[PDB]
Amino acid sequence: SMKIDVVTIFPEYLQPVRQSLPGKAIDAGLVDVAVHDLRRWTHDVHKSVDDSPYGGGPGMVMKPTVWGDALDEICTSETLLVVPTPAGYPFTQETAWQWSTEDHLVIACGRYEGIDQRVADDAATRMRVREVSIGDYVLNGGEAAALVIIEAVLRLVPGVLGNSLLEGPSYTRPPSWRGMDVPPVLLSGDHAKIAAWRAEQSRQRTIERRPDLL
Amino acid sequence: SMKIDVVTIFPEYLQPVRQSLPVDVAVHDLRRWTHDVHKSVDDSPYGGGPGMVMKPTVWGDALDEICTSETLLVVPTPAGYPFTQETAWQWSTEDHLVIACGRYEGIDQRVADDAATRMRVREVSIGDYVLNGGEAAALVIIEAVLRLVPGSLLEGPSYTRPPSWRGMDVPPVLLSGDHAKIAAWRAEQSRQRTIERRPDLLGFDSP
Ligand SMILES: Nc1c(O)cccc1[N+](=O)[O-]
Ligand SMILES: Nc1c(O)cccc1[N+](=O)[O-]
Numbered sequence: 001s002m003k004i005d006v007v008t009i010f011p012e013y014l015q016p017v018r019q020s021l022p023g024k025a026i027d028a029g030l031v032d033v034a035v036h037d038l039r040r041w042t043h044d045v046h047k048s049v050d051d052s053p054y055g056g057g058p059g060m061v062m063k064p065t066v067w068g069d070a071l072d073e074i075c076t077s078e079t080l081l082v083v084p085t086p087a088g089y090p091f092t093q094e095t096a097w098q099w100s101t102e103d104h105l106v107i108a109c110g111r112y113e114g115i116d117q118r119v120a121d122d123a124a125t126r127m128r129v130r131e132v133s134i135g136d137y138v139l140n141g142g143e144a145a146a147l148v149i150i151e152a153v154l155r156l157v158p159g160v161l162g163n164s165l166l167e168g169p170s171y172t173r174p175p176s177w178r179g180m181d182v183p184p185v186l187l188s189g190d191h192a193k194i195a196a197w198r199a200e201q202s203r204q205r206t207i208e209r210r211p212d213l214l
Numbered sequence: 215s216m217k218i219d220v221v222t223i224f225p226e227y228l229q230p231v232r233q234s235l236p237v238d239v240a241v242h243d244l245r246r247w248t249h250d251v252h253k254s255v256d257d258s259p260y261g262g263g264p265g266m267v268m269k270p271t272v273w274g275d276a277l278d279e280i281c282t283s284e285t286l287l288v289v290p291t292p293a294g295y296p297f298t299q300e301t302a303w304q305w306s307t308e309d310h311l312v313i314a315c316g317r318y319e320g321i322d323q324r325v326a327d328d329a330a331t332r333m334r335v336r337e338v339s340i341g342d343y344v345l346n347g348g349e350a351a352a353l354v355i356i357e358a359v360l361r362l363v364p365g366s367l368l369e370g371p372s373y374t375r376p377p378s379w380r381g382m383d384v385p386p387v388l389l390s391g392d393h394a395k396i397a398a399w400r401a402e403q404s405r406q407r408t409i410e411r412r413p414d415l416l417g418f419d420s421p
Contacts, residue, residue, distance in 0.1 A: 013230045020227060051374040055388035055396045061374040068380070087368040089411045093343045117371035118382045131411075135341045137299045137358040143230070144354045151350050152343040166293040169323030172257040172267040178274065180324045186261030194261045209295045209337075 002102060002157050004033045005074050006146055007067075008109040009049055011035045013143040017150055022162060030159040033150065041070040050112050057113065064116035067108065071123055075106050081129045082107045083120055084145035088132035091149060095132065100156035107149065109142035166210055168201030216308060216363055219280050220352050221273075222315040223255060227349045231356055237363060239356065247275040256318050263319070270322040273314065277329055281312050287335045288313045289326055290351035294338035297355060301338065305355075306362035313355065315348035368412055370403035 006014050014035040025031050039047045043065065050060035075081060080102045084091075099105060108115065123129050134145045154160050171182040185197045206213050218239045220228050228241040245253040256266035281287060286308050290297075305311065314321065329335050340351045373384040387399045414420050 010233070012233045016227050016229055020224075054373045054375075054377070054384050055400070056393075057372075061372040063374060064379050065376070087370070087407055087411065091341070091343060096343055114369070114372050116373050116379075118373070118379055118384075122380055122382060134343070135297070135354070137297060137302055137340070137354070138361070139354070139357050140361055144350075144357050147230070147353060148341070148343070148345065148350050151345050155344065155346055167320070168293075170263075170267045170320050171260045171322050171324070172269055173260075174271070175260075177270050177322075177324050178328050180327060182260045191262065198261070205293060209293070 001029060002031050002100075002105065002154070004031075004105045004107065004150060004154075005036060006033070006107045006109065006150075007036045007038050007070050007074065008141075008143055008146070009038045009111060010109075010141070010143055011037045014146065017147055021154075022160065024162070025160045028159060031154060031157060036070070036074065038066065038070055041066050041073070053113065060112040062110055062112060062115040062119075064119050064122075067115055067119040068122065071106070071108070071119065075123065075127055076104070077127055079104045079106050079127045081120070081123050081127055082146075082149060083115070083129065083131045084109065084134065084142035084149065085114060085131050086133050086136075086138060087114075089130070091132040091134050091145075091152075093152070095130075096149075096152040096156055099153045105153070107142075107146045109146050111141035164213065165202040166206045166213070168198050168205055216306075216311065216360075218311045218313065218356060218360075220313045220315065220349075220356075221276050221280065222347075222349055222352070223317055224315075224347070224349055228352065230353055234357070235360075237360055242276065242280065244272060244276055247272050247279070259319065265319040267319055268316055268321040268325075270324045270328070273321060273325040274328060277312070277314070277325070281329070281333055282310070283332055285310045285312050285333045287326075287329050287333055288352075288355065289316070289321065289335065289337045290314075290340065290348035290355070291316065291320060291337050292339055292342075292344065293320075295336070297338040297340050297351075297358075299358070301336075302355075302358040302362055305359045307364070311359070313348070313352045315352055317347040366415060367401075367404040368408045368415070370400050370407060 018033050050062050053061045120129050134148045175182050216237045221242045221244050223244045225241045225243045231239050255272050256268050259267045326335050340354050377384045387395050
């Protein structure tokens with residue numbers, strides 16, 4: 001049973017993942033995802049969420065007073081606060097597993113050059129805070145990362161889904177297609193040989209594509 | 215200029231792009247290329263195993279219509295080469311990206327094999343986590359690439375006003391106006407952060 005709250009200045013970005021949730025899981029109260037417009041917590045008629053960086057630099061920094069108010073309202077002491085950031089610890093499948101048992105995740109999506117560091121530092125004095133990165137590529141903001149994290153975590157939550165080495169190639173019908181035959185070993189009925197063939201394909205593909213895994 | 219076509223059995227999920235764009239991005243329902251009226255796109259794997267594999271026939275017909283010889287065909291897959299910022303720079307000058315989003319247990323390998331006989335094909339992973347399909351990966355790839363289209367160390371902490379908030383001060387050096395001291399402090403924060411969070415970037419063992 002997980003509640004995920006996402007806070008973002010582009011709530012529209014997160015709406016399809018909300019609607020993508022299986023009806024059965026929602027009706028069974030297994031999962032709920034709520035998306036919040038950060039500007040709900042702005043102080044001024046211009047709905048300002050950012051300001052210039054102390055010490056100079058490019059772009060803007062998201063305001064701590066706005067974020068502080070948002071998180072005060074949404075978080076409790078039991079919340080796991082997730083802050084996507086290119087400067088985070090790596091988000092891995094082990095991370096997803098660990099988070100899949102949580103009662104409450106709050107995902108704070110940043111933009112511009114990030115969120116004033118005191119927001120996370122203050123939050124960390126009364127709840128668990130995790131700054132994480134989903135990869136070594138540069139995004140404009142945290143929403144795409146939130147989407148990846150939500151998908152990876154929720155498919156591990158018991159119910160939501162319904163009812164090493166790289167994977168090698170897979171095949172299905174037809175047995176011959178555009179001059180290419182399914183490897184005959186797969187149609188052999190020799191299931192120990194099939195498993196050995198798959199193991200070797202995995203080893204080859206891992207060596208070629210992901211030598212770091214070895 | 216760049217055209218991106220995304221092929222998926224969940225086109226409604228790609229709508230986070232059409233909000234985020236002033237390049238052209240078009241999304242295609244894979245089932246438009248089925249002839250059966252169950253609109254079936256998958257079947258059990260040869261050789262056995264759990265789940266289903268997407269049939270090559272439907273994909274072949276879709277890609278036949280959408281791709282040309284100059285197309286860069288991108289196939290997100292947990293079994294891909296890593297998609298990195300270097301990849302994003304490389305792809306930022308392409309005229310035409312087609313992103314083939316798999317579901318179930320992936321796409322019959324012959325789809326990529328056949329495509330590679332007439333265009334360039336790149337199977338890539340955005341990370342070592344398990345997604346339900348390639349659509350979220352497509353969104354990440356599109357965002358990383360589009361921001362680079364013409365037209366080391368972790369980043370340290372950032373701060374803005376007010377200089378004191380809930381009794382927490384912005385590090386005084388950042389208010390000093392001393393550019394050399396600020397650069398030095400930022401370099402040191404970045405060093406600490408990278409060693410702690412991403413030692414691999416500096417050539418050390420991961421925990
Ligand atoms: N990489 C990145 C980014 O550039 C911006 C926000 C979040 C992330 N991330 O989670 O990896
Ligand atoms: N990791 C993953 C996946 O589980 C499914 C499709 C694509 C990816 N990926 O690009 O990393």
